[PDB]
Symmetry: C3
Amino acid sequence: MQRIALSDKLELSRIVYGMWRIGDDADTSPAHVQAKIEACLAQGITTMDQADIYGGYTAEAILGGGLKAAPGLRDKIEIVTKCGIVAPAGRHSSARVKHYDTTAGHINVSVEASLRDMGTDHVDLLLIHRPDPLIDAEETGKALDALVASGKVKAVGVSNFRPWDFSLLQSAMSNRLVTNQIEMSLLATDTFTNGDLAYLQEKRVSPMAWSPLGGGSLFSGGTMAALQRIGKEQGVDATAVAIAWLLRHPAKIVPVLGTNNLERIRTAADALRVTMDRQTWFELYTLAIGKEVALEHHH
Amino acid sequence: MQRIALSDKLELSRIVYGMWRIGDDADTSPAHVQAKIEACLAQGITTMDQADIYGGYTAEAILGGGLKAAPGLRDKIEIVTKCGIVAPAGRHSSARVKHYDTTAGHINVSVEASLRDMGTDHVDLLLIHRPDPLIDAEETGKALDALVASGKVKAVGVSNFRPWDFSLLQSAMSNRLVTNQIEMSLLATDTFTNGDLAYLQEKRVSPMAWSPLGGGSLFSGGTMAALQRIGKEQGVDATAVAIAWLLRHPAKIVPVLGTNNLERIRTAADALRVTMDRQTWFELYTLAIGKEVALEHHH
Amino acid sequence: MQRIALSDKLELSRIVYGMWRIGDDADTSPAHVQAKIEACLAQGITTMDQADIYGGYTAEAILGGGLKAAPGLRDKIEIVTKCGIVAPAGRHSSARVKHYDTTAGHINVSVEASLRDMGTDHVDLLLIHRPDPLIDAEETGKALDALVASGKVKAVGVSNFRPWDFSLLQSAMSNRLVTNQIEMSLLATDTFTNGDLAYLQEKRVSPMAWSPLGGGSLFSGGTMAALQRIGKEQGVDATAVAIAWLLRHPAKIVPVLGTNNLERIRTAADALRVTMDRQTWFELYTLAIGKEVALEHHH
């Protein structure tokens, strides 16, 4: 599969496999985890997306069971992980309330646990998982810079940051943030006009798109009819067209697909087969927003 | 009429004549087009505002009929035109959907058609007509820079851009964008407090105000009574006061007036006769917003 | 009381005494004004917050009655004052409408009146009281710079500015704006996520928080029960906990407390006795917003 360079130091697969449901599968054995990773690799999807909090702080260890039992498998993938969200589950069950923690001490503890749980000495990309209204940017930026200098983390980014959050944390760091993982799909189009995507495009930062299929709501009329029509014109399913709509954007959006289904992994690359011309991009955008683009103001 | 320098390379009349309705007139003859331009020139209004899309891609050619039959008339005016909006009309009737196109190829084709249609070798100002959610800023900025270097376009700006759109496109260009054509009037006051006008004021960019009379809704109670009162105090009509309210702002707003009526052209300059002191500016602003300005927070 | 350096030139008390109600007290005698200032000084609160408009342009003169009758008292305090709001009261009663005035002439007249009314040759901090939709930033910034160079004003800031207002005025000034006085409390939490506080945090500018108790609405269920519980755990009242919630933020927020009650002045410093850990900060923030913080987007 085509590669995307987020920076001179980090290259992903153009589509990323989200592992947030890996702990929900009835099968969490090393063998089934390896099978899922091997199905991705068969399609050239090498990038796995994790977070400390997934599975109530167990999804990384479940991935680790796979990796620790298959020597050589970690060298074939990039691992994205995240920290900053503290819910009273698993190892954080002492917690009195759901909160964010962007402190140097917490980031280091979470990274040490990610490395322990997945059986590796480095993660390819670490994201601050949510913007913290209590962030000390100086402290957080120093911790993130030291994690890169150490080699434990190849690159750093953020998730769900607004442009002003991104700007504040980048002002406190020597290393450049290489991504912002944000909701983007035909059902979530605000970032295209509200400044979120423009900011990233001006900074030459690729976003990672979460819920790129619209979070299950798109498949459950006019939008779906057009996705199915284009798919049938190009020999792919409506799912591939909804991902290709993201891939078409010149901001170089990196979709994160989160299925436990080996047959949807088998077809995930079909999005790269879609030719999405400018007019088709607008047809889908207009059906999704439910109204025509603004025409001449003088009318 | 008083001149306004948008830059060292482009100077307009302080009021601009919008030609978006020129094709709606029952009379589209060269003679009637010349009459309208000559009525503007009689009031010192030298700047004409066009767009490729006006008249379903025919308004420029209708202006051209006037200019081509009156040698010397083009040298007396500045021409603003715009591109980026593609509706299925006239030469774009093959189009499947209403969309934006900011590609180098489309901008060049639209500019070549503007020059052909108006019978000139240059336009004074070219605007991207709407912010394109699919913009490639690098590509668009290269096309706009080459159009300036070529002499085909004296200066470039945008229309309906948010500050983040303006910032993204300017980051990709060597030439400075000299304006943003946005809605501003007593019925459209959001830009005064929402950051749109502050951004332009910090960049020392004059906006062009579209629908400066409120788009026909202002004339169709308290606001109109005050405009009529001030006009009767200063020997002008309520229309001149509504334009002078824009002219008073220190951001150096350039109103675009869009009438086919020779008698409203004859009086358009009366706005420059209005003395609009700070208190009068606030009286009108407060009547328009329908509530007092925020006073001391401690109360 | 702990000091806060807004800059190399200006240091306040970490809590500020707002004098906006000083004219509402039945007692406005010099003796009662001195008593209030002496109650603050007894708690290490040295910073007094004024504005030209307070008391309909009489509150400064009422403070002055106190200061002029107590030689040496002005040297013990810092004075913050503000201008820019013109209401038809007192010396501005000729005014036809409520408006803003950020002109050099008005700022100078207001500062000269603040110095005359309080009987001093300098103010520690001058704020533009409200963002003016008619601001000429070049003119206002020149007036503010000259006021600092003159020694009449030790430092300048703003009040109720949005980030774009702050950015515009700072672009026109040589001196750095040292604060933005904005609404911040458990009932006013928008600035924590909407970019207002992030902007100030990136610029290393401390905000001053007005209505830090929520403007009387907080004391008049779940939020109050938690403030009372934490206070009873730490030997202080719920008021001290609501102020400590602001003091905990790493942006170094400076609360402005506006009581005429000598017994609430006597206890105002109790906020500095509160230990507010990250989880407690989130518990209060969550009770105030009325919903959990956003958890993992993948769920």
